[PDB]
């Protein structure tokens, strides 16, 4: 399978993608690119680095002035988060690895919604009180997940940060936290002392926490982590973190382990996750309301005593409602204890932050079909009554496959997108009529049709007529496509006229 699709290769690696107002924004090393939605042509670029950072040089100003090199270090600016806000005047909000993890806001001029250079504001207020706090230090260079949400008429950021112990009295980052933007737009605020839950300094180095994904649902906020099973355990697992969606602080904070298995082969390391509604057929199969949010997560086996993915993959689905039932009804005390890395192990306590002991289990929905492969990306969408997943591998391979408990399915779309691993940062857009996903691989991003690609595989009318029926392929005068893409009045699944 070889296809030519709308694509874009950046000057550097791409970290994040965001779709706004029919323009595509790329968070990449040292650049933010603005692409056209139609053809993915570059409309503009914004140079974010490299920047010269230093002890003396201060956040949210250029010290290129005194690039004197007294102690100057050039650093590439990796995009850690990229957010659009339309609650305040439309803005792109971008946070990079350098300058204490501060964010910058690019305010679009009234008629030019692709201009991120005219008005750029660096978000920073000097900590007013006598404070060791840095609400403006948002994002960690080790890895961060930013979930943005409007609540109570404020823009709130929920953030997951991987941390070490190389940190300051100012410039402390938090593992997990909620903070809000000030209406003045010149800074962020932690509301209470419970707005952040941090790994004890004592463990910051030995207990890394990676944040795979984050989402809202059911009035709750959810993060997905990878981390050690225990403070001093040599093994790793995936956890789902739940807390109340409030800005005043993190409430009802609970962590829960997630086992994805195959039938007892544990796939203990989540690679990518996507939450969406289930198609009709699948909903019935899994006891869901067409209404219900489903967490689809591709898991991988780790090498012994490691968090390194081993090239064996599974995909388990977790109905939020299902997940919630376990969070909501404690059952055995034996399964619950004080959050081990937040309080110590020997805390008096051992609000009250909690972790579960046993893992919540699901069963590979692809029936071991991806055991010899490493899935690195996943998005999910409905087509008619079907649920379809868009998978990517460590090898640059892209697949579309139908999701069902009733039998396995060979992907109806499967091809090599690139040499580079498929990025987990994906976008799904439903142009009502039709739809595409944006998939990243290295420095390239590709625009893939959600539906008609199965057909484009067939080069001739004959091949096209002998396509498997569920793809709904047909011949429009010189090409194989689904009914809806035929502008030559006449589309056929029955007749090939003379060549």
């Amino acid at each position: 399978m070889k296809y030519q699709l709308p694509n874009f290769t950046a000057e550097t690696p791409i970290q994040n993608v965001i779709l706004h107002e029919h323009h595509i924004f790329l968070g990449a090393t040292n650049y933010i690119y603005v692409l056209n939605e139609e053809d993915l042509q570059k409309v503009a670029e914004y140079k974010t680095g490299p920047v010269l950072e230093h002890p003396d040089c201060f956040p949210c100003q250029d010290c290129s002035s005194k690039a004197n090199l007294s102690g100057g270090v050039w650093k590439d600016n990796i995009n850690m988060a990229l957010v659009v806000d339309t609650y305040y005047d439309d803005q792109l909000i971008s946070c990079g690895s350098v300058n204490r993890g501060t964010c910058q806001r690019h305010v679009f001029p009234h008629n030019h919604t692709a201009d991120i250079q005219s008005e750029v504001h660096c978000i920073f207020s000097p900590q007013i009180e006598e404070p060791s706090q840095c609400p403006d230090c948002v994002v960690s260079a080790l890895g961060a997940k930013v979930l943005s949400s409007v609540k109570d008429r404020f823009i709130n950021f929920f953030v997951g940060n991987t941390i070490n112990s190389s940190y300051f009295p100012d410039h402390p980052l938090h593992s997990i936290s909620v903070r809000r933007l000030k209406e003045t737009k010149d800074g962020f605020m932690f509301l209470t002392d419970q707005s952040y839950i941090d790994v004890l300094p004592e463990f910051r180095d030995s207990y890394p926490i990676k944040y795979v994904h984050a989402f809202e649902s059911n009035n709750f906020i959810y993060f997905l982590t990878v981390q050690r099973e225990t403070l001093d355990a040599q093994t790793f697992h995936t956890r789902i973190i739940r807390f109340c969606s409030i800005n005043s602080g993190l409430h009802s904070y609970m962590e829960m382990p997630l086992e994805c298995i195959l039938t007892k082969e544990v796939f203990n390391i989540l690679q990518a996750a996507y939450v969406s509604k289930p198609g009709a057929q699948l909903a019935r199969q899994i006891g869901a309301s067409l209404n219900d949010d489903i967490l689809f997560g591709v898991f991988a086996q780790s090498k012994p005593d490691s968090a390194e993915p081993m090239d064996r993959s599974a995909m388990c689905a977790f109905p939020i409602k299902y997940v919630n039932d376990f969070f909501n009804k404690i059952v055995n005390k034996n399964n619950v204890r004080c959050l081990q890395h937040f309080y110590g192990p020997n805390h008096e306590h051992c609000e009250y932050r909690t972790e579960f002991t046993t893992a919540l289990q699901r069963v590979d929905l692809f029936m071991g079909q991806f055991s010899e492969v490493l899935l690195t990306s996943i998005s999910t969408f409905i087509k008619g009554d079907l649920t379809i997943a868009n998978l990517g591998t460590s090898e640059g391979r892209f697949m579309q496959v139908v999701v069902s408990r009733s039998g396995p399915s060979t992907p109806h779309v499967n091809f090599l997108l690139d040499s580079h691993p498929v990025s987990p940062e994906v976008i799904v857009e439903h142009t009502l009529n039709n739809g595409y996903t944006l998939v990243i691989t290295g420095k390239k991003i590709t625009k893939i049709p959600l539906n008609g690609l199965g057909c484009r595989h067939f080069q001739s009318c004959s091949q096209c007529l002998s396509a498997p029926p569920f793809v709904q392929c047909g011949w429009c005068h010189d090409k194989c496509v689904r009914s809806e893409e035929c502008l030559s009045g006449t589309w056929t699944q029955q007749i090939c006229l003379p060549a």
Epitope: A280, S289, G384, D385
Partner: antibody, heavy 119, light 114 residues
């Protein structure tokens, strides 16, 4: 032909517990959710819950989430509705049910047993 | 819940008459991807399981006499029974199976004038 038969109906004190049986035949038991519905004499229909025989997953009308339980035995192609802290308004006819596919709600039903919660 | 409101609770009509039962839901039962409404109509004879008449709002089930017809979209649905027959005395229930818990309408008692 799909066939569903309830059992265990009868008289039960308020406060007490009762286990209803639903033995199924004529389809792959593990491939369909097994639903329970009830109806108080001369009243409307109320949906109780359902279990997935393949893994024993459950879904309950928020009303019975606390007091009710559903179990299954794959070897017996039978589902059990377990009720506790039964009270007057639980006196009703209890049907078990299932469907042909995702296109329909319930296609097949039992005869229903009568549960009377009295002293 | 999703609340189901049937109207009327009772009606008494003659053999051969067109009867109309109404069913309103508190939110859309429309599944947009296939453009199907997840609403169904049951018929219940005394001391009997409910029998499925119509599913997806307007699709008549196999066997069901031609005179039963569903219609409506979104929040408003209608079960019509033209040419009412004597064996049609029963209680008709609209049910949504769009989300859990599944919910029925109060049911409409249908009696035959004669």
């Amino acid at each position: 032909e799909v066939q569903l038969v309830e059992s265990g109906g009868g008289l039960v004190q308020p406060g007490g517990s009762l286990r209803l049986s639903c033995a199924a035949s004529g389809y792959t038991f593990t491939s369909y959710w097994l639903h329970w519905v009830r109806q108080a004499p001369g009243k409307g229909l109320e949906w109780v819950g359902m279990i997935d025989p393949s893994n024993s997953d459950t879904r309950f009308n928020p009303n019975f989430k606390d007091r009710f339980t559903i179990s299954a035995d794959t070897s017996k192609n039978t589902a059990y509705l377990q009720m506790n802290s039964l009270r007057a308004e639980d006196t009703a006819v209890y049907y078990c049910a299932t469907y042909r596919s995702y296109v329909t709600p319930l296609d097949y039903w039992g005869q229903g047993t009568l549960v009377t919660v009295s002293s | 819940d999703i609340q189901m409101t049937q109207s009327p609770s009772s009606l008494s009509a003659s053999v051969g008459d067109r009867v109309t039962i109404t069913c309103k839901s508190s939110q859309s039962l429309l599944y947009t991807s296939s453009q199907k409404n997840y609403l169904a109509w049951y018929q219940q004879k005394p001391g009997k399981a409910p029998k499925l008449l119509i599913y997806w709002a307007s699709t008549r089930e196999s066997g069901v006499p031609s005179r039963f017809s569903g219609s409506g979209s979104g929040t408003d649905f209608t079960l019509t029974i033209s040419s009412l027959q004597p064996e049609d005395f029963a209680t008709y229930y609209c049910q949504q199976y769009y989300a859990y818990p599944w919910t029925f309408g109060q049911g409409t008692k249908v009696e035959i004038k004669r």
